[PDB]
Design a protein around this ligand. Sequence first.
Ligand SMILES: CCCCCCCCCCCCCCCCC[C@@H](O)O[C@H](CO[C@H](O)CCCCCCCCCCCCCCC)COP(=O)(O)OCC[N+](C)(C)C
Lengths: 70, 57
Amino acid sequence: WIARTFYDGPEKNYEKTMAILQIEAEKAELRLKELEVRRLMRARGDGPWYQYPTIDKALIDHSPKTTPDN
Amino acid sequence: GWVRPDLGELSKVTKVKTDRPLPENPYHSRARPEPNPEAEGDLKPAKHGSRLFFWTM
Ligand SMILES: CCCCCCCCCCCCCCCCC[C@@H](O)O[C@H](CO[C@H](O)CCCCCCCCCCCCCCC)COP(=O)(O)OCC[N+](C)(C)C
């Protein structure tokens, strides 16, 4: 009666633990991958992150400058 | 038979017919570096949320 009224079968806890383990293992893998990706982008600078600004090329004046040799 | 140019005439911008080829690279520029991959795609929710320590959202 106690088991019927208050508790649940072993399979429920078993499968819930499987799901929790899957979720947290995926999270750990994603954390390692994030660290590696951050290191690579900061070292190289070829990704969307760590893009430090440079001078805009639309600021340059392309017109004769009173002197042929600029 | 020489006629003196009037005011405002010697300061005009004119055109020249020449056979000299137009230089393709007068600045002697090098090859420009290739730009970044400029990723594009569809946004999906972050996988398992923030994933910051014990937070589940
Ligand atoms: C002769 C008898 C011998 C055995 C006596 C046993 C008496 C039991 C009393 C102590 C029980 C402690 C509580 C244990 C469980 C409570 C918490 C939780 O586990 O139970 C909840 C349920 O709790 C109960 O609904 C309520 C328990 C409250 C007991 C109160 C007893 C004492 C009350 C005293 C009041 C006195 C009167 C007022 C005077 C002013 C959730 O259960 P639920 O998730 O649904 O279960 C679903 C199971 N399924 C999935 C298989 C279907």
